[PDB]
């Protein structure tokens, strides 16, 4: 990769120092809960349209590991099966983390109103969604959940892998430890949102972290993001920045070519 | 039939040593019966009151808008005691009330309450204080029109 890891580490250290110095002027709580954003600038639009299902990048240092993070899980019918699974055969950390289990029918019934959607949006930090019903969640959750990319429902696979299914007699679910592993992986994963834009922002860590962990997360996100989600791979990549919510952007990678290819250069 | 099925399920739960609340959930119904609804209004439990326009004797409901106004309850006068009876499985119903609904219908109830307040109560706020009747018959109306025309001409 063209990205220099030493320069990435220098950027992480300088950004953390600047965030601390700005927050010093509770201080520790202000330094904490401050996300670190990795910003990718491309030469063309990274996608043709708005894709409302985030891509997951698995990190050596997973996110949302704090115990105060509340997770809402949106499944297919019935919700009773998954609620009993969480209450009975889930590990205690995930049982404490999962604050709500609701199926799609109950979601469409009780959260059609915009103010109800906003209340549900405020009550949780991370939303997970079964892939059987995730294409219906833009309609059920509206622009309340999808104007902003921060709390979009993350895809999880809960379906058993190979008429109308009756939810009561069969749930068509994969085994519970596999569900637990999938949920833990998706909670920890970094999220990539594809929009018809030259700008993609990915949350890689917080300001209370260590610069080594931040740089490692930045490196793996850069690799997986350019490989998987960027058309024309490193040829389309123009700029790479690291920034805080109120800080400036530190370039970690910048290009020498401002054009896509030689076909863009015409005489 | 629904009550018979529910009682059979509760008898089954009692037989297997469970409370009836374990197999039965809290019900949400339209409240009816005039004495019951007047009690709910006085206890300020009713959220919306619908009163039939054709109760005979009229004294049974003639105090109801004043009572609802004193308790701050949204009410509306609606046409049909038979129409309200179709709600409550009876031939007629003098009055119906809603106290509480389910969570998926709470928004619909609040929108209906706001619609009742803005489109019925505000529109009848002045006309409810007026005297009714005093309409003249057809031939008498024509007689007074002719008399006034003759007086204006002469």
């Amino acid at each position: 990769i063209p990205v220099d890891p030493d320069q990435t580490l220098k950027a992480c250290k300088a950004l953390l120092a600047h965030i601390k110095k700005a927050a010093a002027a509770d201080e520790e709580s202000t330094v904490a809960e401050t996300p670190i954003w990795l910003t990718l600038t491309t030469k063309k639009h990274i996608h043709d349209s708005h894709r409302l299902q985030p891509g997951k990048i698995i990190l050596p240092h997973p996110l949302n590991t704090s115990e105060e993070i509340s997770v809402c899980l949106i499944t297919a019918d019935p919700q009773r099966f998954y609620k009993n699974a969480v209450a009975d055969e889930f590990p205690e950390d995930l049982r404490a983390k999962i604050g709500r289990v609701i199926d799609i029918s109950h979601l469409k019934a009780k959260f059609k109103a915009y103010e109800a959607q906003r209340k549900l949006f405020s009550e949780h930090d991370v939303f997970l969604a079964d892939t059987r019903i995730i294409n219906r969640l833009p309609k059920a959750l509206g622009k309340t959940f999808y104007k902003t990319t921060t709390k979009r429902p993350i895809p999880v696979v809960l379906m058993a892998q190979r008429e109308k299914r009756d939810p009561l007699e069969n749930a068509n679910a994969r085994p519970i430890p596999e569900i637990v592993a999938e949920i833990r992986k998706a909670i920890g994963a970094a999220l990539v949102h594809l929009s018809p834009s030259t700008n993609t922002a990915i949350k890689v860590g917080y300001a209370n972290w260590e610069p080594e962990k931040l740089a490692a997360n930045i490196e793996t996100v850069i690799r997986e993001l350019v490989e998987r989600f960027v058309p024309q791979k490193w040829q389309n990549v123009r700029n790479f920045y690291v920034k805080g919510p109120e800080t400036a952007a530190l370039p970690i990678y910048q290009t020498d070519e401002l054009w896509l290819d030689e076909s863009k250069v015409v005489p | 039939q629904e009550k018979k099925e529910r009682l059979l399920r509760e008898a089954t739960a009692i037989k297997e040593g469970k409370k009836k609340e374990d197999v039965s959930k809290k019900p949400y119904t339209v409240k009816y019966g005039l004495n019951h609804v007047v009690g709910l209004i006085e206890n300020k439990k009713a959220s919306l009151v619908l009163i039939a326009n054709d109760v005979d004797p009229i004294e049974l409901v003639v105090f109801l808008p004043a009572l609802c106004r004193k308790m701050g309850i949204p009410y509306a006068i609606i046409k049909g005691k038979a129409r309200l009876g179709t709600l409550v499985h009876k031939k007629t119903a003098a009055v119906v009330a809603i106290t509480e609904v389910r969570s998926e219908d709470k928004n619909e109830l609040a929108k209906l309450i706001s619609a009742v307040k803005e489109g019925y109560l505000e529109k009848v706020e002045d006309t409810r204080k007026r005297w009714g009747g005093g309409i003249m018959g057809f031939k008498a109306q024509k007689r007074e029109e002719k008399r006034k025309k003759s007086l204006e001409t002469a």
Partner: peptide
Amino acid sequence: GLKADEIIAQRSALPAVSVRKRA
């Protein structure tokens, strides 16, 4: 809470009238 809940529960300042103490 919800504005819908407030609108449904809105009453007047007059206290409630009870026939008797209830269980």
